[PDB]
Amino acid sequence: HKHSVIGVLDSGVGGLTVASEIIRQLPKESICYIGDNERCPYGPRSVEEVQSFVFEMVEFLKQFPLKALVVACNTAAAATLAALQEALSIPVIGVIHPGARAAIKVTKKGKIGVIGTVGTIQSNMYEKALHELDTYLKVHSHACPTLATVVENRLEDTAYVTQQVKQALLPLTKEDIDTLILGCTHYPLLESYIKKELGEDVTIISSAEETAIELSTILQHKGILADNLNPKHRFFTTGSVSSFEHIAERWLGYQISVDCVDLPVK
Amino acid sequence: HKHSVIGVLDSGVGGLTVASEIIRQLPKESICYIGDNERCPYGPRSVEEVQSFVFEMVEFLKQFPLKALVVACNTAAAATLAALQEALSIPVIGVIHPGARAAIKVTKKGKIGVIGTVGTIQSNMYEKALHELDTYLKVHSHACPTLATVVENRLEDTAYVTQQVKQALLPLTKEDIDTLILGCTHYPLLESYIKKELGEDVTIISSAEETAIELSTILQHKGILADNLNPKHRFFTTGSVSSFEHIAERWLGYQISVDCVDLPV
Numbered sequence: 001h002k003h004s005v006i007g008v009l010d011s012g013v014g015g016l017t018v019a020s021e022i023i024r025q026l027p028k029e030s031i032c033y034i035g036d037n038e039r040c041p042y043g044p045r046s047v048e049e050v051q052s053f054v055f056e057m058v059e060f061l062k063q064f065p066l067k068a069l070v071v072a073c074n075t076a077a078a079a080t081l082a083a084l085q086e087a088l089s090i091p092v093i094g095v096i097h098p099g100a101r102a103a104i105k106v107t108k109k110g111k112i113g114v115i116g117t118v119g120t121i122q123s124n125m126y127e128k129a130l131h132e133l134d135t136y137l138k139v140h141s142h143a144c145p146t147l148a149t150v151v152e153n154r155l156e157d158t159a160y161v162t163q164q165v166k167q168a169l170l171p172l173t174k175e176d177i178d179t180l181i182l183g184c185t186h187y188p189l190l191e192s193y194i195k196k197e198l199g200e201d202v203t204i205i206s207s208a209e210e211t212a213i214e215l216s217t218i219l220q221h222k223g224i225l226a227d228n229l230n231p232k233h234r235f236f237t238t239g240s241v242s243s244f245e246h247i248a249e250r251w252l253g254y255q256i257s258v259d260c261v262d263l264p265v266k
Numbered sequence: 267h268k269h270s271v272i273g274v275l276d277s278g279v280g281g282l283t284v285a286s287e288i289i290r291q292l293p294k295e296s297i298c299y300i301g302d303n304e305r306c307p308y309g310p311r312s313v314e315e316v317q318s319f320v321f322e323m324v325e326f327l328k329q330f331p332l333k334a335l336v337v338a339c340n341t342a343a344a345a346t347l348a349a350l351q352e353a354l355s356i357p358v359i360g361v362i363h364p365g366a367r368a369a370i371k372v373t374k375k376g377k378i379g380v381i382g383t384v385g386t387i388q389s390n391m392y393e394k395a396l397h398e399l400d401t402y403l404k405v406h407s408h409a410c411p412t413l414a415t416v417v418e419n420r421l422e423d424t425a426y427v428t429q430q431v432k433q434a435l436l437p438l439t440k441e442d443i444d445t446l447i448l449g450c451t452h453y454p455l456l457e458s459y460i461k462k463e464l465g466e467d468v469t470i471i472s473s474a475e476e477t478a479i480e481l482s483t484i485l486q487h488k489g490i491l492a493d494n495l496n497p498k499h500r501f502f503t504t505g506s507v508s509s510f511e512h513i514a515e516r517w518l519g520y521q522i523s524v525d526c527v528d529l530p531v
Protein backbone atom coordinates (compact mmCIF):
# COMPACT_ATOMS: atom_id res chain seq x y z
CA HIS A 1 0.00 0.00 0.00
CA LYS A 2 2.92 2.45 0.11
CA HIS A 3 2.20 3.64 -3.45
CA SER A 4 -1.58 3.29 -3.29
CA VAL A 5 -3.85 6.29 -3.78
CA ILE A 6 -7.20 7.56 -2.58
CA GLY A 7 -9.66 7.51 -5.49
CA VAL A 8 -12.17 10.42 -5.36
CA LEU A 9 -15.18 10.65 -7.67
CA ASP A 10 -17.70 13.44 -8.15
CA SER A 11 -20.14 14.71 -10.72
CA GLY A 12 -17.80 17.64 -11.53
CA VAL A 13 -15.84 20.38 -9.77
CA GLY A 14 -17.86 20.52 -6.55
CA GLY A 15 -15.96 17.56 -5.17
CA LEU A 16 -12.89 19.81 -4.91
CA THR A 17 -14.25 20.86 -1.51
CA VAL A 18 -13.85 17.24 -0.40
CA ALA A 19 -10.48 16.85 -2.08
CA SER A 20 -9.17 19.98 -0.35
CA GLU A 21 -10.15 18.64 3.05
CA ILE A 22 -8.47 15.26 2.39
CA ILE A 23 -5.32 17.12 1.26
CA ARG A 24 -5.42 19.22 4.45
CA GLN A 25 -6.21 16.54 7.05
CA LEU A 26 -4.33 13.62 5.41
CA PRO A 27 -1.33 15.42 3.89
CA LYS A 28 0.63 12.23 3.29
CA GLU A 29 -2.05 10.62 1.08
CA SER A 30 -2.16 10.86 -2.73
CA ILE A 31 -5.35 11.92 -4.49
CA CYS A 32 -6.59 10.61 -7.86
CA TYR A 33 -9.78 12.55 -8.65
CA ILE A 34 -12.35 12.19 -11.41
CA GLY A 35 -15.14 14.73 -12.00
CA ASP A 36 -17.82 13.91 -14.60
CA ASN A 37 -18.36 17.50 -15.69
CA GLU A 38 -19.73 16.49 -19.08
CA ARG A 39 -22.78 14.97 -17.36
CA CYS A 40 -23.06 17.34 -14.36
CA PRO A 41 -25.53 17.92 -12.73
CA TYR A 42 -26.48 14.58 -11.23
CA GLY A 43 -28.97 16.20 -8.87
CA PRO A 44 -31.97 16.06 -11.26
CA ARG A 45 -31.05 12.70 -12.81
CA SER A 46 -32.67 9.32 -12.18
CA VAL A 47 -31.08 7.01 -9.62
CA GLU A 48 -30.48 4.31 -12.25
CA GLU A 49 -28.64 6.76 -14.47
CA VAL A 50 -26.50 8.15 -11.68
CA GLN A 51 -25.52 4.64 -10.59
CA SER A 52 -24.41 3.77 -14.13
CA PHE A 53 -22.30 6.94 -14.40
CA VAL A 54 -20.68 6.34 -11.01
CA PHE A 55 -19.74 2.80 -11.97
CA GLU A 56 -18.16 4.16 -15.17
CA MET A 57 -16.01 6.48 -13.02
CA VAL A 58 -15.07 3.57 -10.74
CA GLU A 59 -13.89 1.63 -13.81
CA PHE A 60 -11.65 4.56 -14.66
CA LEU A 61 -10.24 4.78 -11.13
CA LYS A 62 -9.55 1.03 -11.05
CA GLN A 63 -6.70 1.66 -13.48
CA PHE A 64 -4.85 3.13 -10.48
CA PRO A 65 -3.69 1.38 -7.32
CA LEU A 66 -6.61 2.32 -5.04
CA LYS A 67 -6.38 1.85 -1.29
CA ALA A 68 -9.81 3.44 -0.77
CA LEU A 69 -12.60 5.20 -2.70
CA VAL A 70 -14.33 8.43 -1.63
CA VAL A 71 -17.70 9.27 -3.22
CA ALA A 72 -17.37 13.00 -2.85
CA CYS A 73 -20.73 13.76 -4.48
CA ASN A 74 -23.71 13.64 -2.09
CA THR A 75 -26.08 12.87 -5.01
CA ALA A 76 -23.85 10.04 -6.20
CA ALA A 77 -23.49 8.70 -2.66
CA ALA A 78 -27.25 8.71 -2.12
CA ALA A 79 -27.76 6.73 -5.29
CA THR A 80 -24.93 4.22 -5.21
CA LEU A 81 -22.98 4.01 -1.96
CA ALA A 82 -24.56 0.68 -0.95
CA ALA A 83 -23.94 -0.78 -4.40
CA LEU A 84 -20.30 0.30 -4.35
CA GLN A 85 -19.58 -0.99 -0.84
CA GLU A 86 -21.00 -4.34 -1.88
CA ALA A 87 -19.10 -4.48 -5.19
CA LEU A 88 -15.63 -3.36 -4.04
CA SER A 89 -13.26 -4.95 -1.55
CA ILE A 90 -11.50 -1.68 -0.66
CA PRO A 91 -13.05 0.78 1.84
CA VAL A 92 -15.63 3.06 0.19
CA ILE A 93 -16.36 6.27 2.12
CA GLY A 94 -19.36 8.38 1.13
CA VAL A 95 -20.02 11.97 2.16
CA ILE A 96 -23.45 11.40 3.74
CA HIS A 97 -22.72 9.23 6.79
CA PRO A 98 -19.79 11.34 8.02
CA GLY A 99 -22.06 14.40 7.95
CA ALA A 100 -24.85 12.59 9.85
CA ARG A 101 -22.35 11.36 12.44
CA ALA A 102 -20.99 14.85 13.01
CA ALA A 103 -24.54 16.23 13.30
CA ILE A 104 -25.23 13.80 16.16
CA LYS A 105 -22.03 14.97 17.85
CA VAL A 106 -22.90 18.69 17.73
CA THR A 107 -26.67 18.74 18.26
CA LYS A 108 -27.91 19.60 21.71
CA LYS A 109 -31.66 19.38 20.90
CA GLY A 110 -31.62 16.40 18.56
CA LYS A 111 -33.20 18.48 15.77
CA ILE A 112 -31.22 18.45 12.55
CA GLY A 113 -31.75 20.09 9.19
CA VAL A 114 -30.12 18.97 5.93
CA ILE A 115 -30.11 20.55 2.49
CA GLY A 116 -29.01 19.12 -0.83
CA THR A 117 -30.04 18.27 -4.37
CA VAL A 118 -33.40 16.81 -5.22
CA GLY A 119 -31.77 13.40 -5.73
CA THR A 120 -30.03 13.53 -2.36
CA ILE A 121 -33.12 14.59 -0.48
CA GLN A 122 -35.54 12.25 -2.27
CA SER A 123 -33.34 9.24 -1.39
CA ASN A 124 -34.00 10.06 2.28
CA MET A 125 -30.53 8.70 3.04
CA TYR A 126 -29.80 11.43 5.58
CA GLU A 127 -32.86 10.64 7.69
CA LYS A 128 -32.14 6.92 7.38
CA ALA A 129 -28.49 7.34 8.38
CA LEU A 130 -29.35 9.57 11.29
CA HIS A 131 -32.04 7.23 12.59
CA GLU A 132 -29.77 4.23 12.32
CA LEU A 133 -27.59 5.86 14.98
CA ASP A 134 -30.38 7.49 17.01
CA THR A 135 -34.04 6.80 16.37
CA TYR A 136 -35.10 9.79 18.52
CA LEU A 137 -33.86 12.59 16.30
CA LYS A 138 -36.08 14.94 14.35
CA VAL A 139 -34.73 15.45 10.82
CA HIS A 140 -35.91 18.14 8.42
CA SER A 141 -34.75 17.49 4.85
CA HIS A 142 -35.10 20.20 2.17
CA ALA A 143 -34.01 20.21 -1.49
CA CYS A 144 -32.30 23.46 -2.64
CA PRO A 145 -32.07 22.88 -6.42
CA THR A 146 -30.78 26.36 -7.35
CA LEU A 147 -27.80 26.47 -5.05
CA ALA A 148 -25.16 24.40 -6.80
CA THR A 149 -25.73 26.26 -10.09
CA VAL A 150 -25.56 29.53 -8.18
CA VAL A 151 -22.19 28.52 -6.78
CA GLU A 152 -20.73 27.58 -10.18
CA ASN A 153 -22.21 30.39 -12.27
CA ARG A 154 -23.36 33.39 -10.23
CA LEU A 155 -21.16 33.47 -7.14
CA GLU A 156 -19.82 36.97 -7.84
CA ASP A 157 -23.36 38.38 -7.96
CA THR A 158 -23.73 38.72 -4.18
CA ALA A 159 -27.21 40.26 -4.29
CA TYR A 160 -28.40 37.31 -6.36
CA VAL A 161 -26.66 34.79 -4.11
CA THR A 162 -28.23 36.34 -1.02
CA GLN A 163 -31.71 36.18 -2.57
CA GLN A 164 -31.28 32.59 -3.70
CA VAL A 165 -29.96 31.48 -0.32
CA LYS A 166 -32.87 33.31 1.38
CA GLN A 167 -35.40 31.56 -0.84
CA ALA A 168 -33.79 28.15 -0.48
CA LEU A 169 -33.61 28.29 3.33
CA LEU A 170 -37.04 29.82 4.00
CA PRO A 171 -38.56 26.41 4.82
CA LEU A 172 -35.84 25.71 7.40
CA THR A 173 -36.11 29.12 9.07
CA LYS A 174 -39.60 27.95 10.07
CA GLU A 175 -38.32 24.77 11.67
CA ASP A 176 -36.76 24.20 15.04
CA ILE A 177 -33.22 22.93 14.35
CA ASP A 178 -29.86 23.60 15.98
CA THR A 179 -27.70 21.83 13.38
CA LEU A 180 -27.64 21.99 9.54
CA ILE A 181 -25.80 19.53 7.31
CA LEU A 182 -24.53 20.99 4.03
CA GLY A 183 -25.51 17.91 2.01
CA CYS A 184 -23.99 19.02 -1.28
CA THR A 185 -20.40 19.49 -2.49
CA HIS A 186 -20.97 23.11 -3.42
CA TYR A 187 -22.51 24.46 -0.26
CA PRO A 188 -19.36 25.19 1.73
CA LEU A 189 -18.81 28.12 -0.63
CA LEU A 190 -22.11 29.57 0.61
CA GLU A 191 -21.35 29.09 4.28
CA SER A 192 -21.32 32.77 5.14
CA TYR A 193 -24.65 33.41 3.45
CA ILE A 194 -26.23 30.42 5.14
CA LYS A 195 -25.03 31.39 8.61
CA LYS A 196 -26.41 34.88 8.11
CA GLU A 197 -29.78 33.44 7.12
CA LEU A 198 -30.14 30.85 9.90
CA GLY A 199 -28.46 32.65 12.78
CA GLU A 200 -25.86 31.96 15.45
CA ASP A 201 -27.90 29.19 17.06
CA VAL A 202 -27.51 26.76 14.17
CA THR A 203 -24.23 24.86 13.80
CA ILE A 204 -23.17 24.31 10.20
CA ILE A 205 -21.69 20.95 9.19
CA SER A 206 -19.53 20.60 6.09
CA SER A 207 -19.67 17.25 4.28
CA ALA A 208 -16.05 17.81 3.20
CA GLU A 209 -14.54 18.41 6.63
CA GLU A 210 -16.31 15.45 8.18
CA THR A 211 -15.58 13.05 5.34
CA ALA A 212 -11.88 13.66 5.54
CA ILE A 213 -11.76 12.87 9.24
CA GLU A 214 -13.95 9.78 8.64
CA LEU A 215 -11.49 8.58 5.97
CA SER A 216 -8.58 9.30 8.36
CA THR A 217 -10.25 7.22 11.08
CA ILE A 218 -10.82 4.27 8.77
CA LEU A 219 -7.39 4.28 7.13
CA GLN A 220 -5.72 4.29 10.53
CA HIS A 221 -8.06 1.61 11.92
CA LYS A 222 -7.12 -0.56 8.95
CA GLY A 223 -3.41 0.19 9.37
CA ILE A 224 -3.05 1.58 5.85
CA LEU A 225 -2.00 5.21 6.30
CA ALA A 226 0.60 6.51 3.83
CA ASP A 227 3.90 7.94 5.10
CA ASN A 228 4.71 10.06 2.00
CA LEU A 229 6.14 13.47 3.03
CA ASN A 230 5.40 15.11 -0.32
CA PRO A 231 2.69 13.42 -2.40
CA LYS A 232 1.31 14.69 -5.68
CA HIS A 233 -2.34 14.67 -6.75
CA ARG A 234 -3.94 14.08 -10.14
CA PHE A 235 -7.29 15.42 -11.34
CA PHE A 236 -9.32 14.20 -14.31
CA THR A 237 -12.47 15.58 -15.93
CA THR A 238 -14.86 14.52 -18.66
CA GLY A 239 -15.60 18.14 -19.53
CA SER A 240 -13.43 21.03 -20.63
CA VAL A 241 -9.96 20.82 -19.13
CA SER A 242 -9.38 24.58 -19.31
CA SER A 243 -12.77 25.15 -17.65
CA PHE A 244 -11.96 22.79 -14.76
CA GLU A 245 -8.48 24.31 -14.27
CA HIS A 246 -9.97 27.81 -14.09
CA ILE A 247 -12.62 27.01 -11.46
CA ALA A 248 -10.13 24.94 -9.49
CA GLU A 249 -7.62 27.77 -9.30
CA ARG A 250 -10.40 30.06 -8.10
CA TRP A 251 -11.63 27.64 -5.43
CA LEU A 252 -8.30 26.26 -4.24
CA GLY A 253 -6.12 29.35 -4.62
CA TYR A 254 -3.57 27.50 -6.75
CA GLN A 255 -3.16 25.55 -9.99
CA ILE A 256 -3.56 21.79 -10.20
CA SER A 257 -2.77 18.97 -12.64
CA VAL A 258 -5.83 18.38 -14.84
CA ASP A 259 -6.29 15.89 -17.68
CA CYS A 260 -9.20 14.88 -19.94
CA VAL A 261 -10.87 11.48 -19.83
CA ASP A 262 -13.62 9.77 -21.82
CA LEU A 263 -16.20 7.56 -20.14
CA PRO A 264 -16.93 4.72 -20.50
CA VAL A 265 -13.28 3.61 -20.45
CA LYS A 266 -11.75 1.80 -23.45
CA HIS B 267 -30.57 -9.61 18.01
CA LYS B 268 -26.98 -8.70 18.94
CA HIS B 269 -26.50 -8.43 22.64
CA SER B 270 -22.86 -7.41 22.66
CA VAL B 271 -21.67 -4.47 24.74
CA ILE B 272 -19.05 -1.77 24.62
CA GLY B 273 -16.47 -2.44 27.34
CA VAL B 274 -15.02 0.78 28.83
CA LEU B 275 -12.09 0.84 31.23
CA ASP B 276 -10.62 3.73 33.22
CA SER B 277 -8.50 4.33 36.29
CA GLY B 278 -11.57 5.55 38.24
CA VAL B 279 -14.48 7.99 37.85
CA GLY B 280 -12.87 10.28 35.28
CA GLY B 281 -13.84 7.96 32.44
CA LEU B 282 -17.49 8.88 33.05
CA THR B 283 -16.84 11.82 30.72
CA VAL B 284 -16.13 9.30 27.94
CA ALA B 285 -19.03 7.08 28.97
CA SER B 286 -21.46 10.02 28.86
CA GLU B 287 -20.37 10.89 25.32
CA ILE B 288 -20.82 7.29 24.13
CA ILE B 289 -24.29 7.21 25.71
CA ARG B 290 -25.14 10.48 23.96
CA GLN B 291 -23.75 9.84 20.46
CA LEU B 292 -24.41 6.08 20.35
CA PRO B 293 -27.69 5.83 22.27
CA LYS B 294 -28.41 2.31 21.07
CA GLU B 295 -25.19 0.80 22.47
CA SER B 296 -24.85 -0.81 25.92
CA ILE B 297 -21.98 0.18 28.17
CA CYS B 298 -20.10 -2.08 30.61
CA TYR B 299 -17.71 0.17 32.54
CA ILE B 300 -14.93 -0.62 35.01
CA GLY B 301 -13.08 2.08 36.98
CA ASP B 302 -10.06 1.00 39.07
CA ASN B 303 -10.64 3.60 41.79
CA GLU B 304 -8.73 1.57 44.40
CA ARG B 305 -5.51 2.17 42.44
CA CYS B 306 -6.28 5.62 41.01
CA PRO B 307 -4.30 7.67 40.08
CA TYR B 308 -2.47 6.02 37.21
CA GLY B 309 -0.85 9.30 36.14
CA PRO B 310 2.23 9.00 38.43
CA ARG B 311 2.62 5.22 38.07
CA SER B 312 5.17 3.30 36.03
CA VAL B 313 4.21 2.12 32.56
CA GLU B 314 4.71 -1.55 33.46
CA GLU B 315 2.43 -1.22 36.46
CA VAL B 316 -0.29 0.58 34.51
CA GLN B 317 -0.13 -2.07 31.77
CA SER B 318 -0.57 -4.79 34.38
CA PHE B 319 -3.61 -3.09 35.95
CA VAL B 320 -5.22 -2.49 32.56
CA PHE B 321 -4.87 -6.12 31.59
CA GLU B 322 -6.53 -7.08 34.90
CA MET B 323 -9.47 -4.84 33.93
CA VAL B 324 -9.62 -6.44 30.48
CA GLU B 325 -9.79 -9.89 32.13
CA PHE B 326 -12.80 -8.62 34.08
CA LEU B 327 -14.51 -7.17 31.02
CA LYS B 328 -13.97 -10.37 29.01
CA GLN B 329 -16.63 -12.01 31.19
CA PHE B 330 -19.13 -10.00 29.12
CA PRO B 331 -19.97 -10.23 25.40
CA LEU B 332 -17.70 -7.42 24.15
CA LYS B 333 -18.06 -6.07 20.62
CA ALA B 334 -15.39 -3.41 21.28
CA LEU B 335 -13.19 -2.00 24.05
CA VAL B 336 -12.70 1.69 24.81
CA VAL B 337 -9.67 2.70 26.89
CA ALA B 338 -11.22 5.79 28.35
CA CYS B 339 -8.18 6.74 30.44
CA ASN B 340 -5.54 8.76 28.57
CA THR B 341 -2.80 7.51 30.93
CA ALA B 342 -3.83 3.90 30.41
CA ALA B 343 -4.08 4.37 26.64
CA ALA B 344 -0.60 5.89 26.50
CA ALA B 345 0.83 2.93 28.34
CA THR B 346 -1.07 0.02 26.86
CA LEU B 347 -3.06 0.76 23.70
CA ALA B 348 -0.59 -0.97 21.38
CA ALA B 349 -0.41 -4.07 23.59
CA LEU B 350 -4.22 -4.30 23.75
CA GLN B 351 -4.74 -3.86 20.01
CA GLU B 352 -2.25 -6.65 19.38
CA ALA B 353 -3.68 -8.98 22.05
CA LEU B 354 -7.42 -8.60 21.36
CA SER B 355 -9.38 -9.53 18.24
CA ILE B 356 -12.13 -6.95 18.85
CA PRO B 357 -11.68 -3.24 17.95
CA VAL B 358 -9.85 -1.38 20.73
CA ILE B 359 -10.40 2.39 20.67
CA GLY B 360 -8.19 4.59 22.86
CA VAL B 361 -8.82 8.24 23.72
CA ILE B 362 -5.55 9.66 22.37
CA HIS B 363 -5.80 9.11 18.61
CA PRO B 364 -9.35 10.48 18.29
CA GLY B 365 -8.22 13.68 20.03
CA ALA B 366 -5.16 14.05 17.76
CA ARG B 367 -7.32 13.48 14.67
CA ALA B 368 -9.84 16.13 15.74
CA ALA B 369 -6.96 18.55 16.45
CA ILE B 370 -5.76 18.16 12.86
CA LYS B 371 -9.29 18.91 11.66
CA VAL B 372 -9.65 22.12 13.64
CA THR B 373 -6.19 23.65 13.55
CA LYS B 374 -5.59 26.42 11.05
CA LYS B 375 -1.93 27.09 11.99
CA GLY B 376 -0.79 23.53 12.60
CA LYS B 377 0.31 24.37 16.17
CA ILE B 378 -1.31 22.13 18.77
CA GLY B 379 -1.02 21.97 22.50
CA VAL B 380 -1.97 19.06 24.72
CA ILE B 381 -2.15 18.65 28.46
CA GLY B 382 -2.46 15.52 30.57
CA THR B 383 -0.88 13.50 33.35
CA VAL B 384 2.86 13.00 33.65
CA GLY B 385 2.46 9.46 32.33
CA THR B 386 0.47 10.60 29.31
CA ILE B 387 2.86 13.37 28.42
CA GLN B 388 6.06 11.39 29.06
CA SER B 389 4.91 8.68 26.66
CA ASN B 390 4.92 11.32 23.92
CA MET B 391 2.08 9.37 22.29
CA TYR B 392 0.27 12.59 21.32
CA GLU B 393 3.19 13.97 19.36
CA LYS B 394 3.77 10.56 17.76
CA ALA B 395 0.11 10.21 16.79
CA LEU B 396 -0.06 13.72 15.39
CA HIS B 397 3.12 13.34 13.37
CA GLU B 398 2.00 10.01 11.98
CA LEU B 399 -0.82 11.90 10.27
CA ASP B 400 1.08 15.14 9.51
CA THR B 401 4.82 15.46 10.05
CA TYR B 402 4.70 19.28 9.71
CA LEU B 403 2.77 20.04 12.88
CA LYS B 404 4.28 21.71 15.93
CA VAL B 405 3.12 20.02 19.15
CA HIS B 406 3.58 21.48 22.64
CA SER B 407 2.99 18.84 25.33
CA HIS B 408 2.71 19.78 28.99
CA ALA B 409 1.93 17.75 32.10
CA CYS B 410 -0.61 19.26 34.52
CA PRO B 411 -0.23 16.84 37.48
CA THR B 412 -2.58 18.65 39.88
CA LEU B 413 -5.62 19.10 37.73
CA ALA B 414 -7.27 15.69 38.01
CA THR B 415 -7.10 15.79 41.82
CA VAL B 416 -8.50 19.35 41.73
CA VAL B 417 -11.45 18.12 39.71
CA GLU B 418 -12.16 15.21 42.09
CA ASN B 419 -11.56 16.96 45.41
CA ARG B 420 -11.59 20.75 45.16
CA LEU B 421 -14.01 21.60 42.35
CA GLU B 422 -16.36 23.66 44.53
CA ASP B 423 -13.50 25.95 45.64
CA THR B 424 -13.55 28.18 42.55
CA ALA B 425 -10.76 30.51 43.65
CA TYR B 426 -8.51 27.49 44.13
CA VAL B 427 -9.50 25.95 40.82
CA THR B 428 -8.81 29.21 38.98
CA GLN B 429 -5.37 29.50 40.58
CA GLN B 430 -4.47 25.87 39.79
CA VAL B 431 -5.64 26.16 36.18
CA LYS B 432 -3.63 29.39 35.83
CA GLN B 433 -0.46 27.74 37.14
CA ALA B 434 -0.93 24.59 35.06
CA LEU B 435 -1.47 26.48 31.80
CA LEU B 436 1.21 29.15 32.26
CA PRO B 437 3.68 27.33 30.00
CA LEU B 438 1.10 27.07 27.20
CA THR B 439 0.12 30.72 27.38
CA LYS B 440 3.73 31.36 26.28
CA GLU B 441 3.35 29.17 23.21
CA ASP B 442 1.77 29.83 19.87
CA ILE B 443 -1.07 27.30 19.54
CA ASP B 444 -4.56 27.55 18.12
CA THR B 445 -5.80 24.15 19.39
CA LEU B 446 -5.57 22.42 22.79
CA ILE B 447 -6.29 18.73 23.38
CA LEU B 448 -7.65 17.94 26.84
CA GLY B 449 -5.59 14.75 27.18
CA CYS B 450 -7.10 13.59 30.47
CA THR B 451 -10.52 12.23 31.46
CA HIS B 452 -11.06 14.94 34.06
CA TYR B 453 -10.35 18.07 32.07
CA PRO B 454 -13.76 18.55 30.44
CA LEU B 455 -14.85 19.52 34.00
CA LEU B 456 -12.49 22.53 33.76
CA GLU B 457 -13.34 23.62 30.24
CA SER B 458 -14.61 27.04 31.30
CA TYR B 459 -11.55 27.83 33.39
CA ILE B 460 -9.27 26.71 30.59
CA LYS B 461 -11.07 28.76 27.95
CA LYS B 462 -10.76 31.81 30.16
CA GLU B 463 -7.01 31.25 30.61
CA LEU B 464 -6.15 30.63 26.95
CA GLY B 465 -8.60 32.96 25.20
CA GLU B 466 -11.02 32.64 22.28
CA ASP B 467 -8.26 31.98 19.76
CA VAL B 468 -7.64 28.45 21.04
CA THR B 469 -10.09 25.68 20.14
CA ILE B 470 -10.40 23.20 23.03
CA ILE B 471 -10.86 19.55 22.15
CA SER B 472 -12.48 17.00 24.46
CA SER B 473 -11.11 13.45 24.40
CA ALA B 474 -14.58 12.19 25.29
CA GLU B 475 -16.47 13.85 22.46
CA GLU B 476 -13.98 12.77 19.84
CA THR B 477 -13.59 9.20 21.09
CA ALA B 478 -17.32 8.62 20.87
CA ILE B 479 -17.48 9.71 17.25
CA GLU B 480 -14.39 7.61 16.48
CA LEU B 481 -16.08 4.58 18.03
CA SER B 482 -19.26 5.34 16.05
CA THR B 483 -17.25 5.50 12.82
CA ILE B 484 -15.56 2.17 13.45
CA LEU B 485 -18.65 0.30 14.58
CA GLN B 486 -20.50 1.40 11.47
CA HIS B 487 -17.55 0.66 9.17
CA LYS B 488 -17.48 -2.88 10.58
CA GLY B 489 -21.26 -3.25 10.29
CA ILE B 490 -21.77 -3.90 13.99
CA LEU B 491 -23.98 -1.07 15.27
CA ALA B 492 -26.59 -2.05 17.85
CA ASP B 493 -30.28 -1.39 17.12
CA ASN B 494 -31.48 -1.38 20.77
CA LEU B 495 -34.02 1.43 21.40
CA ASN B 496 -33.56 1.37 25.18
CA PRO B 497 -30.30 -0.13 26.45
CA LYS B 498 -29.10 -0.21 30.05
CA HIS B 499 -25.54 0.37 31.24
CA ARG B 500 -23.61 -1.10 34.13
CA PHE B 501 -20.72 0.39 36.05
CA PHE B 502 -18.18 -1.38 38.22
CA THR B 503 -15.53 0.00 40.57
CA THR B 504 -12.70 -1.41 42.64
CA GLY B 505 -13.14 1.35 45.20
CA SER B 506 -15.99 2.48 47.38
CA VAL B 507 -19.32 1.90 45.68
CA SER B 508 -21.07 4.68 47.60
CA SER B 509 -18.27 7.10 46.74
CA PHE B 510 -18.47 6.26 43.02
CA GLU B 511 -22.28 6.61 43.03
CA HIS B 512 -22.02 10.06 44.64
CA ILE B 513 -19.52 11.56 42.19
CA ALA B 514 -21.33 9.96 39.26
CA GLU B 515 -24.60 11.55 40.36
CA ARG B 516 -22.88 14.94 40.57
CA TRP B 517 -21.17 14.65 37.17
CA LEU B 518 -23.96 13.02 35.18
CA GLY B 519 -26.96 14.61 36.86
CA TYR B 520 -28.61 11.28 37.62
CA GLN B 521 -28.03 7.97 39.41
CA ILE B 522 -26.45 4.91 37.79
CA SER B 523 -26.03 1.19 38.47
CA VAL B 524 -22.77 0.63 40.37
CA ASP B 525 -21.30 -2.61 41.71
CA CYS B 526 -18.02 -3.50 43.44
CA VAL B 527 -15.39 -5.71 41.84
CA ASP B 528 -12.10 -7.24 42.93
CA LEU B 529 -9.03 -7.35 40.70
CA PRO B 530 -7.34 -9.55 39.70
CA VAL B 531 -10.33 -11.75 38.84
Ligand SMILES: N[C@H](CCC(=O)O)C(=O)O
Binds near residue numbers: 040120183185
Ligand atom coordinates in the same frame (compact mmCIF):
# COMPACT_ATOMS: atom_id res chain seq x y z
N1 LIG C 1 -21.85 17.21 -6.51
C1 LIG C 1 -23.34 17.29 -6.38
C2 LIG C 1 -23.82 18.71 -6.73
C3 LIG C 1 -23.82 18.84 -8.27
C4 LIG C 1 -24.71 17.93 -9.00
O1 LIG C 1 -25.94 18.03 -9.00
O2 LIG C 1 -24.12 16.96 -9.66
C5 LIG C 1 -23.75 16.94 -4.99
O3 LIG C 1 -22.82 16.96 -4.07
O4 LIG C 1 -24.90 16.64 -4.71
Ligand SMILES: N[C@H](CCC(=O)O)C(=O)O
Binds near residue numbers: 310452
Ligand atom coordinates in the same frame (compact mmCIF):
# COMPACT_ATOMS: atom_id res chain seq x y z
N1 LIG D 1 -8.01 8.85 33.99
C1 LIG D 1 -6.66 9.51 34.03
C2 LIG D 1 -6.66 10.64 35.05
C3 LIG D 1 -6.59 10.03 36.46
C4 LIG D 1 -5.44 9.15 36.75
O1 LIG D 1 -4.26 9.74 36.90
O2 LIG D 1 -5.57 7.94 36.82
C5 LIG D 1 -6.30 10.05 32.68
O3 LIG D 1 -7.29 10.19 31.80
O4 LIG D 1 -5.14 10.36 32.38
Ligand SMILES: [K+]
Binds near residue numbers: 038238239261262263
Ligand atom coordinates in the same frame (compact mmCIF):
# COMPACT_ATOMS: atom_id res chain seq x y z
K1 LIG E 1 -15.16 13.24 -22.23
Ligand SMILES: [K+]
Ligand atom coordinates in the same frame (compact mmCIF):
# COMPACT_ATOMS: atom_id res chain seq x y z
K1 LIG F 1 -2.40 23.06 47.74
